[PDB]
Amino acid sequence: KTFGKRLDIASGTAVRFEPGEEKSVELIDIGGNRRIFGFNALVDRQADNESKKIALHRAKERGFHGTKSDDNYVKTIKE
Amino acid sequence: MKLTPKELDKLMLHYAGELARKRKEKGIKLNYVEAVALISAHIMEEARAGKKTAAELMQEGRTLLKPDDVMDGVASMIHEVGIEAMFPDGTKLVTVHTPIEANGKLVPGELFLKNEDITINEGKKAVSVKVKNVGDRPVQIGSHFHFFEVNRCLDFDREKTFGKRLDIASGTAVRFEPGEEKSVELIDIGGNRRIFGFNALVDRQADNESKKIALHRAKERGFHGTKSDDNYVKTIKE
Amino acid sequence: IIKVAGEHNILPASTNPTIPFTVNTEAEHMDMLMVCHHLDKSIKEDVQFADSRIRPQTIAAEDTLHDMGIFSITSSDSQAMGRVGEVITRTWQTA
Numbered sequence: 223k224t225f226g227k228r229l230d231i232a233s234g235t236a237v238r239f240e241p242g243e244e245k246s247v248e249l250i251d252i253g254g255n256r257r258i259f260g261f262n263a264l265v266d267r268q269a270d271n272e273s274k275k276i277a278l279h280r281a282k283e284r285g286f287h288g289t290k291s292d293d294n295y296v297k298t299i300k301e
Numbered sequence: 302m303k304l305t306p307k308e309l310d311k312l313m314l315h316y317a318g319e320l321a322r323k324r325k326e327k328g329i330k331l332n333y334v335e336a337v338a339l340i341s342a343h344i345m346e347e348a349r350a351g352k353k354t355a356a357e358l359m360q361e362g363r364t365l366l367k368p369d370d371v372m373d374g375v376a377s378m379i380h381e382v383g384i385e386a387m388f389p390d391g392t393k394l395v396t397v398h399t400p401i402e403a404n405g406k407l408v409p410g411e412l413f414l415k416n417e418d419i420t421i422n423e424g425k426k427a428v429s430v431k432v433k434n435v436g437d438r439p440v441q442i443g444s445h446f447h448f449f450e451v452n453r454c455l456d457f458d459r460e461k462t463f464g465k466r467l468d469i470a471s472g473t474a475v476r477f478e479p480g481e482e483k484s485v486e487l488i489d490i491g492g493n494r495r496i497f498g499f500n501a502l503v504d505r506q507a508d509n510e511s512k513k514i515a516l517h518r519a520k521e522r523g524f525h526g527t528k529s530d531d532n533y534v535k536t537i538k539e
Numbered sequence: 540i541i542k543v544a545g546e547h548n549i550l551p552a553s554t555n556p557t558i559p560f561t562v563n564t565e566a567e568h569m570d571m572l573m574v575c576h577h578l579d580k581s582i583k584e585d586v587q588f589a590d591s592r593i594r595p596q597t598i599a600a601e602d603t604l605h606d607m608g609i610f611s612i613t614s615s616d617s618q619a620m621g622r623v624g625e626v627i628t629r630t631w632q633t634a
């Protein structure tokens with residue numbers, strides 16, 4: 223539910239999570255051309271529904287918590 | 302005649318041998334050059350005659366000079382004499398091993414050694430690993446090869462050999478016949494411990510982080526005896 | 540192929556012989572397709588190929604997609620199913 227989104231807070235501020243802490247946050251869509259490069263190299267391309275499946279598969283293989291991508295994933299020619 | 306340069310060189314060698322034979326007939330003890338020339342010229346003439354094999358000439362070359370026929374020190378200087386000669390089936394190489402026995406005490410270039418042993422790889426503690434060749438072809442491993450990355454038909458506990466090499470003399474090797482099983486001694490690789498090449502299973506700094514990647518790569522490529530657990534977690538650069 | 544005009548990374552263009560959609564458009568394009576591919580009406584595979592190519596439904600949709608700002612560029616395809624002196628005129632006819 224958080225693909226292509228960022229925190230809806232004042233620009234330059236932050237949200238802190240202590241160990242064991244649980245809370246809710248507010249998220250809004252990234253603007254502009256929505257081209258996402260860097261950050262953990264899970265996307266490195268245009269953000270859309272096609273790139274979301276690749277990003278979820280990459281996140282599951284690298285052990286990011288809470289990522290659910292189905293078994294029998296079909297690879298593309300450029301991943 | 303259409304002589305080649307090879308024919309001219311061999312003609313010169315033949316007459317050097319003839320001069321040595323004339324000096325032997327006059328009762329003169331032969332030196333190093335004369336003895337080498339005499340043996341070479343005799344082998345070339347016997348091969349031209351065409352009645353003997355090369356293996357017979359290898360033994361016949363050892364009877365030409367008695368120990369009393371040469372000067373003191375000649376026999377220790379001549380370890381082998383090689384000569385190519387044309388047989389009826391073509392040009393072959395004939396090597397004569399130790400043609401003259403020695404009879405005096407003069408050894409030119411003699412070595413006088415101490416009797417203390419040399420300790421190699423001082424301060425390196427070794428471990429012992431049992432290795433079995435389950436393939437059908439022989440395998441031989443050198444002293445400085447990264448032992449983790451040897452031929453995939455060798456079966457051993459590969460986890461214990463990461464970053465290690467054989468504890469033998471530098472430039473020697475250990476041989477495994479098909480079906481053979483034996484133990485070897487391994488010590489840590491020195492220097493900066495940067496391992497590049499060999500099967501491209503590491504290609505980076507050797508440490509505990511790089512060992513997990515190497516074990517996963519070795520299991521995917523079918524190297525025997527590699528144990529890496531299921532549900533492996535990939536990194537950003539593998 | 541028309542579904543890619545909704546995507547973010549695509550810059551979509553139309554050529555002028557299909558705009559604006561007129562009552563002579565389909566027959567003209569069908570007869571152009573029969574000449575260039577050397578098709579025959581007596582073969583069931585050439586007829587099946589031609590009916591999957593022309594498609595008056597998507598041709599009719601193209602004008603409305605231009606009016607919505609989903610198509611963004613007009614062009615000629617000059618002397619290769621298109622008319623090099625009519626790009627501006629056919630744009631304003633469609634508007």
Ligand SMILES: Cc1cc(C)cc(-n2ccnc2SCC(=O)NO)c1
Pocket residue numbers: 568571572575576616619620
């Ligand atoms: C509908 C049509 C019209 C014309 C003049 C030619 C073709 N035609 C023939 C072979 N291949 C093609 S399609 C390439 C094209 O017309 N522009 O790229 C199709």
Ligand code: NI
Pocket residue numbers: 616619
């Ligand atoms: Ni064209």
